[PDB]
């Protein structure tokens, strides 16, 4: 077993980023993961992830989004792994009927973000492959884009390990023992202690936070994505087809241009199966909704991308009641940091969250404004 300065439980999107930030500073860190990140059992696989700046979930996310983007460019320069591609991100929906589109526009105004505003046929004309009604409007963000999530984690890990961070893989943490001046974790592979603890177990936060005497409503969701054979002359990243997140009458959908002919990737954001991370069925197609919900969108808005299903993936969201993250110190233990409930839209922020967690762990404070992610906020229902 062993003592460390800081122990990160759950070395995924947020945990690995935090580990890199801590290692960068010579802090002796131990990262423990139930698997070997990047892997396919958590919430970070599927190759790609969208990063937006003009934020429809709330203009208050923009600062963290912009910091995260600069950190993603810094990472790109530090590793041989591909990190980011500037595909741009298109957001559209029925004019005057999408709160999501409206807040994106408002967020762009408020932070002076570079965006293109277009409507109806202008959308169809600019991007062959997209067919929306004339009453639809859109906001395009040219400088945001796509992150290669597994590469990001792969890179952060290599860099952190090179700096002395230790990563104990295939080791599930089973319990916590917190004291006024130190922390302790129990695993089948042994116990470990440290001065500070960062808890970032993803979907498992919903099951294991009780071990830290925390009772926070968190619901894991089974969320699938599909890769479809597409008309490359319209949907390839090479011809500038963008990443997208749109709101139509029956929900919100997000997708990616085809990269090297992998096909257009699509996901249905507002619907998923309520599940438990330990019993979830990770095979794509076991629910008729998996493929049908995707094709229903494609046949209507992007017909040339409604070809054979090339690959399907199953992944998880961990939602809070207000769908805002939880990044804060444990209410009763200043030496414990919690990172949870990223509600299906937290990867783009993982670089910035890594920095935030590092600062909270080492100082109990952060230069970032994270009040909207407070663990004590009412809309969370925390006890
Ligand atoms: C699922 C999903 C999510 C998603 C997305 C598409 C899909 C299908 N597209 C996104 C996008 O385009 N843009 C964006 O910003 N986010 C998007 N997301 C959401 C994002 O992927 C998630 O918010 C993010 O991955 C959350 O990160 P977090 O770090 O919370 O989760 P993780 O990466 O799964 O890491 C948790 C790790 O902890 C380990 N673990 C679990 N239990 C234990 C125990 N007991 N002991 C030790 N380790 C444990 C896991 O193994 C995992 O590695
Ligand atoms: Cl995915
Ligand atoms: Cl999530």
Swiss-Prot record:
Its recorded reaction(s) are: sarcosine + O2 + H2O = formaldehyde + glycine + H2O2
What keywords were assigned to this record?
Cytoplasm, FAD, Flavoprotein, Oxidoreductase
Q: What is its EC class?
A: oxidoreductase
> What is the stated purpose of this protein?
Catalyzes the oxidative demethylation of sarcosine. Can also oxidize other secondary amino acids such as N-methyl-L-alanine.
Q: Which residues carry this modification: S-8alpha-FAD cysteine?
A: 315
Which Enzyme Commission number(s) are on file for it? Answer: 1.5.3.1
What broad class describes the main subcellular location of this protein?
Answer: cytoplasm
> Member of which family?
Belongs to the MSOX/MTOX family. MSOX subfamily.
Q: Which organism is it from?
A: Bacillus sp. (strain B-0618)
Single GO cellular component term? cytoplasm
Q: How does it assemble?
A: Monomer.
Alphabetical list of Gene3D superfamilies matching this protein: D-Amino Acid Oxidase, subunit A, domain 2, FAD/NAD(P)-binding domain
Cofactor(s) annotated in UniProt:
FAD
GO terms for MF: flavin adenine dinucleotide binding; sarcosine oxidase activity
**Binding sites annotated in the UniProt record for FAD:** 5-35
The record's SUPFAM superfamilies line, in alphabetical order, gives: FAD-linked reductases, C-terminal domain, FAD/NAD(P)-binding domain
Which locations, inside or outside the cell, does it occupy?
Answer: Cytoplasm
Activity regulation summary: Pyrrole-2-carboxylate is a competitive inhibitor. N-(cyclopropyl)glycine (CPG) is a mechanism-based inhibitor and inactivates the enzyme by covalently modifying the flavin.
What does the record note about the cofactor? Binds 1 FAD per subunit.
Q: Which PANTHER family match?
A: FAD DEPENDENT OXIDOREDUCTASE DOMAIN-CONTAINING PROTEIN, PEROXISOMAL SARCOSINE OXIDASE
Query: What is the recorded name of this protein?
Result: Monomeric sarcosine oxidase
